[model samples]
Target: EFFDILEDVKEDHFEKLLEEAVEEVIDSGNELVRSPTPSNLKRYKNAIKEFLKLIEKKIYKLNSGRARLHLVVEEVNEKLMDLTEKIMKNEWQTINLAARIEEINGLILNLYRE
Candidate 1:
């Protein structure tokens, strides 16, 4: 029998990273709202991208087998993808972006849980 084994990441470590990532997403939305510049918009999009990356990474680390009960991660990825494309030309209301960030936190809470 093989001796190698997969050691799952500590929950606290992922939680901490998730917390910071969500905060960056929230802050970028805020900054974009406060000043709708291309620069800020780019950061806003970048934050969303980073958040998605964290989700994927967490899954690979935390998964012992699967997580198909909720069906969350893909939907959020699609939503964010659509939103990201839409914002490529111009920015949306800062309020909407703020709401979107909150949605991500909720989705990720469920996602990272299961």
Candidate 2:
């Protein structure tokens, strides 16, 4: 149906948004590890929060759409919540936040833009 075509366009927009947020979080995460400064860690956490915010926005927009996409964002959001706790405790030595966030990017890649 033509409706499917329209859905593809909307999904593309969300893919770009989610990808940008994921990349931002990964970039911020790397900066924190490279320097390990308190302020950098704060920025890293903010980036993570920003990604979650985008995910929440997508959840609303994707209502009644792909179940896997919805589950993917929710799963990523939950992972971010867990990672935030580790970051707050300065547990970089133990937590692989970059890989954790990368999981979301990987999940997005699997979505086929719809």
Candidate 3:
């Protein structure tokens, strides 16, 4: 009765709570090994799409074109430059960061080429 009494007070009824609490922790830890991004793959894909679309169009149109889209391209370019310079300078730590962007870029380009 005492155990049941404790269970009755909680909306999740204890069992579900315990199960999900553990699940939450495991999910959180998954981010440590994987990306913490929501729709991470989708966002990466979208960014790649934007990059390719602008490149294919061959003009950075502002209002009528990719004028407002400059920020995304600029950000990607910045990341690329940072990665390239770091790699050339042989900073090992930069390799990991650069690799991440490069992998994402490669995947995006692969999809775009399709």
Candidate 4:
């Protein structure tokens, strides 16, 4: 006979990281709008790229039997990808980015409940 054991893992802190990332994304968008300079634009784009990478990494981690998957996670990734395209094309607006970030934050908070 064989026995299976399971242990509870804490996830509140990691979920907090996603919240902070959403805030950072909004901040970067604001910075780009406030300056609109080439240098600032590049910086903001790079920041967005970094966040995209981090989010993808987190999603992978969550999918690896470590956390539950919800439809909202896919939605969040899609929104981020759209924002990435807008950032690359230099066609992003502060209002839209802010809204997207807020939506993502709320979805993540709901999903990360442990």
Candidate 5:
């Protein structure tokens, strides 16, 4: 049952990484509130990009586990990509940004429930 144990460890690690990545994305957005400037905005988006990249790597390590996790990550990746585009176009207003962050949080909660 060594493989079983290994799978369990990978799942546990993946779960933790998922939670941390979600939080990092949210926190990156929140950081903009304290310093609403072009530099902070760019940094916040880059932070999210880096977090997504890191979590994507973690997700790749898991051979078989919850399918929902992959779906959620994909959704979040899409959302972040959209946000990045908006940021580039100077179209991400506060309300829209907050809504996206809320959506991400809700998805993370759903993942925890699953």
Candidate 6:
């Protein structure tokens, strides 16, 4: 039981980290766009790469527990697909990460409540 709780906490921490990394990417891009200076652009690009690596780590952790979370995972899965499509289309400027995170959190929170 203790181990189960520890795993749950670890997973939650990982997911939260993932979200923070995404926020960093979004914020960094916004900063770069606003300034459009060489230094700012360089910093923004570095942030993007760092965040991408964090996301990769998160994915690695997620795959380990994928089977157990299959039912509730749909909430995140849907958003991930949308994110992928937006990324592919270079539509990051249009996506409001805050809003998407709220929506995804609500769905997952509700699922756990049930």
Best by lDDT: 2
Residue 81 in candidate 6 has what lDDT? 65
User: Residue pairs in steric clash, candidate 3?
Assistant: 61-66, 61-67, 62-67
Evaluation by lDDT, superior candidate among 3 and 5: 5
How does candidate 5 score on lDDT? 0.66
Instruction: Please report, in order, the local distance difference test score of every candidate based on alpha carbons.
Output: 0.64, 0.67, 0.46, 0.57, 0.66, 0.56
Global lDDT for candidate 4? 0.57
Question: lDDT tens string, model 6, 1-114?
Answer: 999999999989976876675666566556655644557644644554555455545544434334434544554666646744654576667866456545654544443322
Model 4, 28-93: lDDT tens digits are 667755655667645655655555555555667544423444465567667757766776787755
Strongest candidate by TM-score:
1
Whole-model lDDT, model 2: 0.67
Which residues of candidate 4, in runs, are more than 4 Å off? 1-68
lDDT score at residue 1, model 3, on the 0-100 scale: 86
* lDDT tens readout by residue for model 2, 1-114: 999999999889877978887777667767765766678856766766676566656655644445766677677567757866787787878888567656745654454344
Better of 3 and 6 by lDDT: 6
Each candidate: RMSD: 5.5, 5.6, 16.8, 7.3, 5.0, 8.8
Better of 1 and 6 by TM-score: 1
TM-score of each: 0.54, 0.49, 0.34, 0.42, 0.52, 0.49
Rank by TM-score (best first): 1, 5, 6, 2, 4, 3
Q: What digit string (tens of lDDT, one per residue) describes model 1 on residues 30-112? A: 78757666798668667767776777775665433245422575777766676666566455643366566567656655654
Clashing pairs in 5: none
| Candidate 2 Cα misplacement greater than 4 A, ranges | 1-26, 32-65
Off by over 4 Å in 5: 1-23, 33-65, 92-95
- Which of candidates 4 and 5 is the stronger one according to lDDT? 5
